Each structure stands twice: as structure tokens, then as C-alpha cells.
């Protein structure tokens, strides 16, 4: 499950060339900005601002991607793609799922980095 | 067993819930509430009325093993049947579950045939 949560191929490359400092530094930024993001997401959902939801998804997808949190990036990919069939019916669950596991994902990442080094 | 028996399906957000909820509707059981993790679950369980727990192993905030442990400790529901349904098939995971007091274990992926037999086995053993 650590493979479905992390972008291992990307991280192993980062470690080889540069080192862990950039990941932890980047992850540090993510941990600070993330709470703000989900909150904005949650807002636009109740208010039903379609562009709102899509826009914020694009932001989290990038935020998560750069730090190697694969499942979050993927979950952001879906939220920012309103052309997908049954987006309306399933979009709310993807948001409740974003809110539910982001901290756990961050934990699994920090853990893997330590063990990795 | 009884048809009004209350179940709680603890699973974050995967295919486990749609599968299990469906197989339960087939065996006759329609009283089924769901939870996202050990935390949410424990809260819902405080409301009482539950007679059966089915749960994953990997969930944020509180995994299935901690939830199992927390349930056994709490005397108000120390005997509540808990069945683990997880991908984890290692030696450590199965022994942990046996020690903690799991009612049963089902490895993923599983088939409707198995899950129904695992349920009907526990139903006899306990006499529901």
C-alpha cells in the first residue's frame, strides 16, 4: 500500500541525485499549505461553484505531485476533470477522501524517507 | 442469524464497501452502516445497537488492528465480533490479529463464496 500512496520511482531518483533535503523542505511547505487548500475545496463544494472546485483541484494536484504523494495527486487529477462521466455523483466522495487521508499520506512519506536513508 | 442485526463496515474509500454491503444485502442483512476509519467507527459504535464489525487493516487516524484492540479493551463491547478483511497476508499481520482477538480473517482479493462462508462460520461458532 506504500506503493499506491507514494511515487517511489520519482523519490528514488531524487535521493540518488540531490538528497532528502529538497523533499523534506518541499513537504514542509505542503504541510502548511494543504490545510488551506482542503478548506477552500470544502467551501466550493457546499456553495457548488464548479470552477471553484476544478481550480483548487489543479492546485492540490501540483502541490502533491511535486512532493511525491501519488494518491493525492491522482485524487486531485479526478477533481480537476469535470468532463469525466458521473463527475457530479462521485466528486463529493473524492473530496471527503482528500480530507480524510492527506495527513496519513504525509506520515507514510516521512517514514519511507527516514527508512530509505 | 437475525435479519435486524446491525453491522458496521469500516473502510476508508475503496471497493471493499460496495462489495461487502452488497453481499450482505444478498444474505438477507439490510441494517448496515459504514465508517471511514477506527476513529469514526468508535464514535458510531458509542451509539450502541451494533452486533457485528467488518473492517480493513490500513486506514488513516486508526488502523484496523488498533480498532480491534480498542474494542476488546472496552468492556461494554469486548465481545463484539470483528472480522478483518485485508490485503496483508504476512506472518506478523495474522498473528497480531489472533492475539488481539479477531473473530476471523479474509485475505484480499476474496470471492463472494468465501466471504459468505466466513460469515456463516462465525455465525455458528458464536450462535447468532
PDB file of C-alpha atoms in Angstrom:
ATOM      1  CA  UNK A   1       0.000   0.000   0.000  1.00  0.00           C
ATOM      2  CA  UNK A   2       3.084   2.194   0.453  1.00  0.00           C
ATOM      3  CA  UNK A   3       3.471   1.918  -3.338  1.00  0.00           C
ATOM      4  CA  UNK A   4      -0.083   3.008  -4.112  1.00  0.00           C
ATOM      5  CA  UNK A   5       0.474   6.041  -1.846  1.00  0.00           C
ATOM      6  CA  UNK A   6       3.943   7.153  -2.906  1.00  0.00           C
ATOM      7  CA  UNK A   7       5.636   7.914  -6.207  1.00  0.00           C
ATOM      8  CA  UNK A   8       8.623   5.683  -5.360  1.00  0.00           C
ATOM      9  CA  UNK A   9      10.165   5.808  -8.881  1.00  0.00           C
ATOM     10  CA  UNK A  10      10.330   9.622  -8.569  1.00  0.00           C
ATOM     11  CA  UNK A  11      11.592   9.690  -4.958  1.00  0.00           C
ATOM     12  CA  UNK A  12      14.352   7.115  -5.501  1.00  0.00           C
ATOM     13  CA  UNK A  13      15.625   9.354  -8.282  1.00  0.00           C
ATOM     14  CA  UNK A  14      15.512  12.436  -6.054  1.00  0.00           C
ATOM     15  CA  UNK A  15      17.523  10.625  -3.378  1.00  0.00           C
ATOM     16  CA  UNK A  16      20.213   9.490  -5.833  1.00  0.00           C
ATOM     17  CA  UNK A  17      20.942  12.875  -7.450  1.00  0.00           C
ATOM     18  CA  UNK A  18      20.261  15.583  -4.825  1.00  0.00           C
ATOM     19  CA  UNK A  19      19.384  14.105  -1.440  1.00  0.00           C
ATOM     20  CA  UNK A  20      16.441  14.198   1.018  1.00  0.00           C
ATOM     21  CA  UNK A  21      16.683  17.901   1.927  1.00  0.00           C
ATOM     22  CA  UNK A  22      14.561  19.071  -1.009  1.00  0.00           C
ATOM     23  CA  UNK A  23      11.810  16.549  -0.315  1.00  0.00           C
ATOM     24  CA  UNK A  24      11.520  17.380   3.392  1.00  0.00           C
ATOM     25  CA  UNK A  25      11.767  21.114   2.622  1.00  0.00           C
ATOM     26  CA  UNK A  26       9.067  20.734  -0.011  1.00  0.00           C
ATOM     27  CA  UNK A  27       6.936  18.500   2.214  1.00  0.00           C
ATOM     28  CA  UNK A  28       7.343  21.164   4.902  1.00  0.00           C
ATOM     29  CA  UNK A  29       5.700  23.682   2.585  1.00  0.00           C
ATOM     30  CA  UNK A  30       2.959  21.196   1.629  1.00  0.00           C
ATOM     31  CA  UNK A  31       2.028  20.511   5.297  1.00  0.00           C
ATOM     32  CA  UNK A  32       1.470  24.241   5.792  1.00  0.00           C
ATOM     33  CA  UNK A  33      -0.484  24.985   2.597  1.00  0.00           C
ATOM     34  CA  UNK A  34      -2.566  21.804   2.456  1.00  0.00           C
ATOM     35  CA  UNK A  35      -4.998  22.632   5.302  1.00  0.00           C
ATOM     36  CA  UNK A  36      -5.823  25.852   3.492  1.00  0.00           C
ATOM     37  CA  UNK A  37      -6.426  24.017   0.234  1.00  0.00           C
ATOM     38  CA  UNK A  38      -8.913  21.400   1.535  1.00  0.00           C
ATOM     39  CA  UNK A  39     -10.806  24.149   3.328  1.00  0.00           C
ATOM     40  CA  UNK A  40     -11.237  26.100   0.085  1.00  0.00           C
ATOM     41  CA  UNK A  41     -12.308  22.834  -1.631  1.00  0.00           C
ATOM     42  CA  UNK A  42     -14.908  22.115   1.037  1.00  0.00           C
ATOM     43  CA  UNK A  43     -16.283  25.618   0.648  1.00  0.00           C
ATOM     44  CA  UNK A  44     -16.784  25.481  -3.094  1.00  0.00           C
ATOM     45  CA  UNK A  45     -18.479  22.090  -2.753  1.00  0.00           C
ATOM     46  CA  UNK A  46     -21.289  23.330  -0.471  1.00  0.00           C
ATOM     47  CA  UNK A  47     -21.567  26.525  -2.497  1.00  0.00           C
ATOM     48  CA  UNK A  48     -21.488  24.372  -5.656  1.00  0.00           C
ATOM     49  CA  UNK A  49     -19.020  26.580  -7.511  1.00  0.00           C
ATOM     50  CA  UNK A  50     -17.954  24.244 -10.333  1.00  0.00           C
ATOM     51  CA  UNK A  51     -14.962  26.343 -11.487  1.00  0.00           C
ATOM     52  CA  UNK A  52     -14.022  26.740  -7.842  1.00  0.00           C
ATOM     53  CA  UNK A  53     -13.744  23.012  -7.257  1.00  0.00           C
ATOM     54  CA  UNK A  54     -11.888  22.401 -10.527  1.00  0.00           C
ATOM     55  CA  UNK A  55      -9.384  25.209  -9.957  1.00  0.00           C
ATOM     56  CA  UNK A  56      -8.469  24.111  -6.410  1.00  0.00           C
ATOM     57  CA  UNK A  57      -8.073  20.550  -7.624  1.00  0.00           C
ATOM     58  CA  UNK A  58      -5.476  21.690 -10.141  1.00  0.00           C
ATOM     59  CA  UNK A  59      -3.596  23.430  -7.333  1.00  0.00           C
ATOM     60  CA  UNK A  60      -3.541  20.439  -4.961  1.00  0.00           C
ATOM     61  CA  UNK A  61      -2.606  18.080  -7.822  1.00  0.00           C
ATOM     62  CA  UNK A  62       0.514  20.138  -8.432  1.00  0.00           C
ATOM     63  CA  UNK A  63       1.245  20.667  -4.744  1.00  0.00           C
ATOM     64  CA  UNK A  64       1.015  16.939  -4.070  1.00  0.00           C
ATOM     65  CA  UNK A  65       2.823  15.910  -7.237  1.00  0.00           C
ATOM     66  CA  UNK A  66       5.976  17.903  -6.613  1.00  0.00           C
ATOM     67  CA  UNK A  67       6.430  16.220  -3.230  1.00  0.00           C
ATOM     68  CA  UNK A  68       5.703  12.709  -4.493  1.00  0.00           C
ATOM     69  CA  UNK A  69       2.338  11.963  -2.886  1.00  0.00           C
ATOM     70  CA  UNK A  70       0.903   9.858  -5.746  1.00  0.00           C
ATOM     71  CA  UNK A  71      -2.552   9.003  -4.446  1.00  0.00           C
ATOM     72  CA  UNK A  72      -3.231  12.655  -3.587  1.00  0.00           C
ATOM     73  CA  UNK A  73      -2.008  13.787  -6.997  1.00  0.00           C
ATOM     74  CA  UNK A  74      -4.276  11.177  -8.563  1.00  0.00           C
ATOM     75  CA  UNK A  75      -7.228  12.210  -6.364  1.00  0.00           C
ATOM     76  CA  UNK A  76      -6.590  15.793  -7.441  1.00  0.00           C
ATOM     77  CA  UNK A  77      -6.462  14.686 -11.081  1.00  0.00           C
ATOM     78  CA  UNK A  78     -10.058  13.499 -10.858  1.00  0.00           C
ATOM     79  CA  UNK A  79     -11.391  16.563  -9.067  1.00  0.00           C
ATOM     80  CA  UNK A  80      -9.973  18.863 -11.756  1.00  0.00           C
ATOM     81  CA  UNK A  81     -11.531  16.793 -14.560  1.00  0.00           C
ATOM     82  CA  UNK A  82     -15.290  17.636 -14.805  1.00  0.00           C
ATOM     83  CA  UNK A  83     -15.656  16.057 -18.275  1.00  0.00           C
ATOM     84  CA  UNK A  84     -15.350  12.618 -16.675  1.00  0.00           C
ATOM     85  CA  UNK A  85     -18.578  10.561 -16.694  1.00  0.00           C
ATOM     86  CA  UNK A  86     -20.588  10.858 -13.463  1.00  0.00           C
ATOM     87  CA  UNK A  87     -18.226  13.504 -12.095  1.00  0.00           C
ATOM     88  CA  UNK A  88     -21.098  15.160 -10.185  1.00  0.00           C
ATOM     89  CA  UNK A  89     -22.174  11.986  -8.405  1.00  0.00           C
ATOM     90  CA  UNK A  90     -18.646  10.889  -7.419  1.00  0.00           C
ATOM     91  CA  UNK A  91     -16.837  14.253  -6.920  1.00  0.00           C
ATOM     92  CA  UNK A  92     -18.015  14.753  -3.343  1.00  0.00           C
ATOM     93  CA  UNK A  93     -16.568  11.432  -2.210  1.00  0.00           C
ATOM     94  CA  UNK A  94     -13.190  12.273  -3.758  1.00  0.00           C
ATOM     95  CA  UNK A  95     -13.176  15.446  -1.668  1.00  0.00           C
ATOM     96  CA  UNK A  96     -14.142  13.665   1.571  1.00  0.00           C
ATOM     97  CA  UNK A  97     -11.349  11.225   0.738  1.00  0.00           C
ATOM     98  CA  UNK A  98      -8.866  14.062   0.166  1.00  0.00           C
ATOM     99  CA  UNK A  99      -9.777  15.446   3.604  1.00  0.00           C
ATOM    100  CA  UNK A 100      -9.539  12.051   5.266  1.00  0.00           C
ATOM    101  CA  UNK A 101      -6.110  10.814   4.233  1.00  0.00           C
ATOM    102  CA  UNK A 102      -3.814  13.717   3.446  1.00  0.00           C
ATOM    103  CA  UNK A 103      -2.130  13.693   6.892  1.00  0.00           C
ATOM    104  CA  UNK A 104      -1.706   9.911   6.847  1.00  0.00           C
ATOM    105  CA  UNK A 105      -0.132  10.102   3.402  1.00  0.00           C
ATOM    106  CA  UNK A 106       2.325  12.731   4.631  1.00  0.00           C
ATOM    107  CA  UNK A 107       3.202  10.413   7.514  1.00  0.00           C
ATOM    108  CA  UNK A 108       3.799   7.438   5.244  1.00  0.00           C
ATOM    109  CA  UNK A 109       6.099   9.670   3.168  1.00  0.00           C
ATOM    110  CA  UNK A 110       8.226  10.958   6.089  1.00  0.00           C
ATOM    111  CA  UNK A 111       8.503   7.387   7.331  1.00  0.00           C
ATOM    112  CA  UNK A 112       9.644   5.988   3.989  1.00  0.00           C
ATOM    113  CA  UNK A 113      12.222   8.782   3.643  1.00  0.00           C
ATOM    114  CA  UNK A 114      13.760   8.003   7.035  1.00  0.00           C
ATOM    115  CA  UNK A 115      13.943   4.232   6.463  1.00  0.00           C
ATOM    116  CA  UNK A 116      15.239   4.965   2.953  1.00  0.00           C
ATOM    117  CA  UNK A 117      18.180   6.914   4.406  1.00  0.00           C
TER     118      UNK A 117
ATOM    119  CA  UNK B   1     -28.934 -15.348  12.189  1.00  0.00           C
ATOM    120  CA  UNK B   2     -31.347 -12.487  12.929  1.00  0.00           C
ATOM    121  CA  UNK B   3     -32.096 -10.155   9.984  1.00  0.00           C
ATOM    122  CA  UNK B   4     -32.226  -6.914  12.001  1.00  0.00           C
ATOM    123  CA  UNK B   5     -28.634  -7.476  13.223  1.00  0.00           C
ATOM    124  CA  UNK B   6     -26.705  -4.213  12.899  1.00  0.00           C
ATOM    125  CA  UNK B   7     -23.384  -4.238  11.013  1.00  0.00           C
ATOM    126  CA  UNK B   8     -20.733  -1.543  10.677  1.00  0.00           C
ATOM    127  CA  UNK B   9     -18.454  -1.584   7.642  1.00  0.00           C
ATOM    128  CA  UNK B  10     -15.195   0.135   8.418  1.00  0.00           C
ATOM    129  CA  UNK B  11     -13.331   1.024   5.243  1.00  0.00           C
ATOM    130  CA  UNK B  12     -11.922   4.370   4.106  1.00  0.00           C
ATOM    131  CA  UNK B  13     -12.944   4.657   0.467  1.00  0.00           C
ATOM    132  CA  UNK B  14     -12.252   1.597  -1.633  1.00  0.00           C
ATOM    133  CA  UNK B  15     -14.180  -1.210  -3.386  1.00  0.00           C
ATOM    134  CA  UNK B  16     -14.495  -3.087  -0.073  1.00  0.00           C
ATOM    135  CA  UNK B  17     -17.619  -1.198   0.968  1.00  0.00           C
ATOM    136  CA  UNK B  18     -19.625  -1.615  -2.239  1.00  0.00           C
ATOM    137  CA  UNK B  19     -18.666  -5.287  -2.313  1.00  0.00           C
ATOM    138  CA  UNK B  20     -19.388  -6.107   1.346  1.00  0.00           C
ATOM    139  CA  UNK B  21     -22.558  -4.029   1.591  1.00  0.00           C
ATOM    140  CA  UNK B  22     -23.866  -5.856  -1.492  1.00  0.00           C
ATOM    141  CA  UNK B  23     -23.003  -9.354  -0.355  1.00  0.00           C
ATOM    142  CA  UNK B  24     -24.718  -8.576   2.937  1.00  0.00           C
ATOM    143  CA  UNK B  25     -27.911  -7.451   1.180  1.00  0.00           C
ATOM    144  CA  UNK B  26     -27.865 -10.804  -0.573  1.00  0.00           C
ATOM    145  CA  UNK B  27     -27.550 -12.886   2.610  1.00  0.00           C
ATOM    146  CA  UNK B  28     -30.602 -11.040   3.918  1.00  0.00           C
ATOM    147  CA  UNK B  29     -28.974  -8.363   6.092  1.00  0.00           C
ATOM    148  CA  UNK B  30     -30.164  -4.802   5.362  1.00  0.00           C
ATOM    149  CA  UNK B  31     -29.187  -2.972   8.559  1.00  0.00           C
ATOM    150  CA  UNK B  32     -25.712  -1.767   7.568  1.00  0.00           C
ATOM    151  CA  UNK B  33     -23.911   1.445   8.485  1.00  0.00           C
ATOM    152  CA  UNK B  34     -20.459   2.438   7.270  1.00  0.00           C
ATOM    153  CA  UNK B  35     -17.392   4.177   8.729  1.00  0.00           C
ATOM    154  CA  UNK B  36     -14.130   5.563   7.281  1.00  0.00           C
ATOM    155  CA  UNK B  37     -11.619   4.533   9.952  1.00  0.00           C
ATOM    156  CA  UNK B  38     -11.114   3.372  13.510  1.00  0.00           C
ATOM    157  CA  UNK B  39     -11.937   6.820  14.831  1.00  0.00           C
ATOM    158  CA  UNK B  40     -15.247   7.421  13.007  1.00  0.00           C
ATOM    159  CA  UNK B  41     -16.095   3.797  13.783  1.00  0.00           C
ATOM    160  CA  UNK B  42     -15.558   4.076  17.574  1.00  0.00           C
ATOM    161  CA  UNK B  43     -17.802   7.156  17.607  1.00  0.00           C
ATOM    162  CA  UNK B  44     -20.580   5.420  15.672  1.00  0.00           C
ATOM    163  CA  UNK B  45     -20.192   2.381  17.959  1.00  0.00           C
ATOM    164  CA  UNK B  46     -20.825   4.531  21.068  1.00  0.00           C
ATOM    165  CA  UNK B  47     -24.420   4.941  19.822  1.00  0.00           C
ATOM    166  CA  UNK B  48     -24.805   1.238  20.557  1.00  0.00           C
ATOM    167  CA  UNK B  49     -27.015  -1.279  18.787  1.00  0.00           C
ATOM    168  CA  UNK B  50     -24.214  -2.784  16.693  1.00  0.00           C
ATOM    169  CA  UNK B  51     -23.820  -6.534  16.696  1.00  0.00           C
ATOM    170  CA  UNK B  52     -21.115  -7.111  14.050  1.00  0.00           C
ATOM    171  CA  UNK B  53     -17.973  -5.356  12.755  1.00  0.00           C
ATOM    172  CA  UNK B  54     -16.224  -5.837   9.388  1.00  0.00           C
ATOM    173  CA  UNK B  55     -13.055  -3.796   8.803  1.00  0.00           C
ATOM    174  CA  UNK B  56      -9.974  -3.111   6.719  1.00  0.00           C
ATOM    175  CA  UNK B  57      -6.488  -3.097   8.223  1.00  0.00           C
ATOM    176  CA  UNK B  58      -4.972   0.053   6.621  1.00  0.00           C
ATOM    177  CA  UNK B  59      -6.860   3.272   7.388  1.00  0.00           C
ATOM    178  CA  UNK B  60      -5.753   6.783   8.407  1.00  0.00           C
ATOM    179  CA  UNK B  61      -6.163   8.033  12.008  1.00  0.00           C
ATOM    180  CA  UNK B  62      -6.537   4.492  13.307  1.00  0.00           C
ATOM    181  CA  UNK B  63      -5.847   1.209  11.544  1.00  0.00           C
ATOM    182  CA  UNK B  64      -7.919  -1.969  11.844  1.00  0.00           C
ATOM    183  CA  UNK B  65      -5.596  -3.544  14.398  1.00  0.00           C
ATOM    184  CA  UNK B  66      -5.813  -0.615  16.829  1.00  0.00           C
ATOM    185  CA  UNK B  67      -9.589  -0.526  16.425  1.00  0.00           C
ATOM    186  CA  UNK B  68      -9.678  -4.248  17.111  1.00  0.00           C
ATOM    187  CA  UNK B  69      -7.588  -3.733  20.271  1.00  0.00           C
ATOM    188  CA  UNK B  70      -9.639  -0.759  21.447  1.00  0.00           C
ATOM    189  CA  UNK B  71     -12.822  -2.843  21.060  1.00  0.00           C
ATOM    190  CA  UNK B  72     -11.528  -5.789  23.098  1.00  0.00           C
ATOM    191  CA  UNK B  73     -10.339  -3.488  25.913  1.00  0.00           C
ATOM    192  CA  UNK B  74     -13.637  -1.640  26.241  1.00  0.00           C
ATOM    193  CA  UNK B  75     -15.867  -3.876  28.359  1.00  0.00           C
ATOM    194  CA  UNK B  76     -19.171  -2.577  27.058  1.00  0.00           C
ATOM    195  CA  UNK B  77     -18.392  -4.285  23.751  1.00  0.00           C
ATOM    196  CA  UNK B  78     -15.471  -6.553  24.471  1.00  0.00           C
ATOM    197  CA  UNK B  79     -17.256  -9.471  22.784  1.00  0.00           C
ATOM    198  CA  UNK B  80     -18.444  -7.693  19.664  1.00  0.00           C
ATOM    199  CA  UNK B  81     -17.463  -9.911  16.693  1.00  0.00           C
ATOM    200  CA  UNK B  82     -14.857  -8.280  14.469  1.00  0.00           C
ATOM    201  CA  UNK B  83     -13.820  -9.701  11.097  1.00  0.00           C
ATOM    202  CA  UNK B  84     -10.704  -8.381   9.343  1.00  0.00           C
ATOM    203  CA  UNK B  85     -10.728  -8.053   5.563  1.00  0.00           C
ATOM    204  CA  UNK B  86      -7.283  -7.027   4.321  1.00  0.00           C
ATOM    205  CA  UNK B  87      -4.607  -7.370   1.619  1.00  0.00           C
ATOM    206  CA  UNK B  88      -1.951  -8.028   4.303  1.00  0.00           C
ATOM    207  CA  UNK B  89      -1.047 -11.743   4.270  1.00  0.00           C
ATOM    208  CA  UNK B  90       2.293 -11.717   6.161  1.00  0.00           C
ATOM    209  CA  UNK B  91       3.046 -13.757   9.325  1.00  0.00           C
ATOM    210  CA  UNK B  92       3.079 -10.684  11.588  1.00  0.00           C
ATOM    211  CA  UNK B  93      -0.345  -9.452  10.484  1.00  0.00           C
ATOM    212  CA  UNK B  94      -2.131 -12.757  11.035  1.00  0.00           C
ATOM    213  CA  UNK B  95      -0.597 -13.437  14.434  1.00  0.00           C
ATOM    214  CA  UNK B  96      -1.313  -9.885  15.590  1.00  0.00           C
ATOM    215  CA  UNK B  97      -4.969 -10.393  14.700  1.00  0.00           C
ATOM    216  CA  UNK B  98      -5.162 -13.758  16.511  1.00  0.00           C
ATOM    217  CA  UNK B  99      -3.568 -12.253  19.639  1.00  0.00           C
ATOM    218  CA  UNK B 100      -5.842  -9.192  19.582  1.00  0.00           C
ATOM    219  CA  UNK B 101      -8.903 -11.396  19.380  1.00  0.00           C
ATOM    220  CA  UNK B 102     -10.068 -11.189  15.754  1.00  0.00           C
ATOM    221  CA  UNK B 103     -13.198 -13.227  15.025  1.00  0.00           C
ATOM    222  CA  UNK B 104     -11.904 -14.086  11.570  1.00  0.00           C
ATOM    223  CA  UNK B 105      -9.621 -13.052   8.720  1.00  0.00           C
ATOM    224  CA  UNK B 106     -10.295 -12.748   4.987  1.00  0.00           C
ATOM    225  CA  UNK B 107      -7.447 -12.009   2.554  1.00  0.00           C
ATOM    226  CA  UNK B 108      -7.906  -9.712  -0.456  1.00  0.00           C
ATOM    227  CA  UNK B 109      -8.897 -10.208  -3.132  1.00  0.00           C
ATOM    228  CA  UNK B 110     -11.654 -12.559  -1.998  1.00  0.00           C
ATOM    229  CA  UNK B 111     -14.716 -14.103  -3.679  1.00  0.00           C
ATOM    230  CA  UNK B 112     -18.399 -13.896  -2.689  1.00  0.00           C
ATOM    231  CA  UNK B 113     -18.224 -17.619  -1.958  1.00  0.00           C
ATOM    232  CA  UNK B 114     -15.532 -17.170   0.703  1.00  0.00           C
ATOM    233  CA  UNK B 115     -16.934 -14.062   2.454  1.00  0.00           C
ATOM    234  CA  UNK B 116     -20.280 -15.848   2.788  1.00  0.00           C
ATOM    235  CA  UNK B 117     -18.646 -18.918   4.304  1.00  0.00           C
ATOM    236  CA  UNK B 118     -16.523 -16.822   6.643  1.00  0.00           C
ATOM    237  CA  UNK B 119     -19.662 -15.099   7.871  1.00  0.00           C
ATOM    238  CA  UNK B 120     -21.702 -18.288   8.233  1.00  0.00           C
ATOM    239  CA  UNK B 121     -18.809 -19.925  10.103  1.00  0.00           C
ATOM    240  CA  UNK B 122     -18.662 -17.150  12.708  1.00  0.00           C
ATOM    241  CA  UNK B 123     -22.461 -17.199  12.974  1.00  0.00           C
ATOM    242  CA  UNK B 124     -22.357 -20.844  14.138  1.00  0.00           C
ATOM    243  CA  UNK B 125     -19.303 -20.566  16.405  1.00  0.00           C
ATOM    244  CA  UNK B 126     -20.973 -17.690  18.273  1.00  0.00           C
ATOM    245  CA  UNK B 127     -24.576 -18.850  17.899  1.00  0.00           C
ATOM    246  CA  UNK B 128     -26.097 -15.660  16.442  1.00  0.00           C
TER     247      UNK B 128
END
